[PDB]
């Protein structure tokens, strides 16, 4: 069991800054550093994948009316609604290969080992979700990134989210078939609190324990370094705080 850093670091009122930290921490990781596990929450917002263009995916006017923040993340996937009822976590480790499918599969096993502590029979997961059998509802979605020396995996777990919002934010081909997808979503996703009575901090504590055991890492709480701090602010100032970025139009490195 090697040493890792647990970062309990969040800016729920600023999802853009939250995603900046995620990229900073990924980007300044030198091969051989202590692996990192971050936990965090976002207030009402839609996060689109890297290859996504906001206007094609989500209803911008519904989002503005209801004060739902738009944000684009560094990784592919996947547009998703987040609120204070989603537990978000990311893991950054050293990498010596480019097998991203292994990473996805490993992290899924750690999620499963974590939900077993809570008495839940959780199941992967072709690649990037975890579900509870009922015939199965998705309770967690994931994405990630790799580069020479480092891999990033991050996921959002539905603990006590408003499941109705997942469909209310998406852009519908015709507004009549808003109902075929809404009733299909509710039948395919659930909260962890639908099955067990847990607070968000006990879900987290199970995750810390599951990830420590499965990854053979001893995660001790740590703070962000100055190096990770600056890079985050810079990434916010130059990239995450821009309309061009969040609308899905900026696809080049600006550091």
């Amino acid at each position: 069991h090697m040493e890792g850093r647990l970062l309990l670091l969040e800016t729920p009122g600023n999802t853009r800054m939250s995603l900046a930290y995620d990229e900073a921490i990924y980007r300044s990781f030198q091969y051989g550093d202590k692996p990192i596990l971050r936990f965090y929450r976002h207030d009402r917002s839609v996060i689109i994948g890297y290859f996504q263009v906001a206007e094609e995916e989500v209803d911008l006017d519904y989002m503005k009316k209801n004060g739902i923040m738009l944000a684009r993340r560094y990784t592919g996937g996947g547009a998703v609604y987040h609120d204070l009822g989603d537990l978000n976590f990311s893991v950054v480790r050293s990498s010596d290969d480019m097998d991203i499918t292994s990473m996805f599969r490993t992290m899924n096993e750690a999620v499963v080992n974590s939900l077993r502590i809570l008495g839940l029979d959780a199941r992967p997961g072709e690649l990037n979700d975890v579900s509870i059998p009922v015939g199965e509802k998705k309770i967690m979605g994931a994405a990630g990134a790799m580069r020479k020396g480092a891999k990033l995996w991050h996921a959002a777990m539905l603990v006590h989210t408003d499941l109705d919002m997942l469909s209310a934010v998406l852009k519908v081909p015709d507004e009549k078939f808003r109902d075929k997808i809404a009733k299909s979503t509710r039948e395919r996703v659930a909260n962890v609190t639908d099955f067990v009575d847990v607070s968000i901090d006990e879900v987290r504590n199970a995750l810390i324990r599951g990830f420590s055991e499965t990854l053979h890492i001893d995660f001790r709480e740590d703070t962000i370094t100055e190096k990770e701090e600056s890079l985050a602010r810079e990434l916010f100032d130059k990239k995450y705080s821009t309309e061009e970025w969040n609308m899905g139009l900026l696809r080049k490195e600006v550091v």
Binding site: Y50, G76, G78, I100, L127, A143, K252
Partner: protein, 88 residues
């Protein structure tokens, strides 16, 4: 003719959206977007640059080439960007 279209395509994991701007038989512009993974990530820009402007006939040449430079596109096969990018 001048022709512009927009197309979705469900792959095994993901959704490729394409917008093509066609001048006769030739690709004037292209924009690829949607729900997928691709490493390197800025390989998406290479794929658009390559198609712009070739001939809608020699698309597969470009797809198969692109992949032979070693691009990883989990749960999205090369014949998925073929279905996405095909009009007729």
């Amino acid at each position: 003719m001048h022709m512009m279209y927009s197309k979705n395509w469900k792959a095994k994991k993901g959704l490729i959206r394409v917008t093509l701007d066609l001048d006769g038989n030739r690709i004037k512009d292209i924009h690829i977007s949607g729900d997928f993974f691709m490493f390197p990530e800025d390989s998406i820009n290479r794929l658009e640059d390559m198609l712009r402007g070739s001939s809608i006939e020699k698309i597969n040449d470009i797809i198969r080439d692109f992949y032979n430079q070693g691009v990883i596109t989990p749960g999205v096969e090369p014949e998925d960007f073929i279905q996405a990018l095909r009009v007729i």
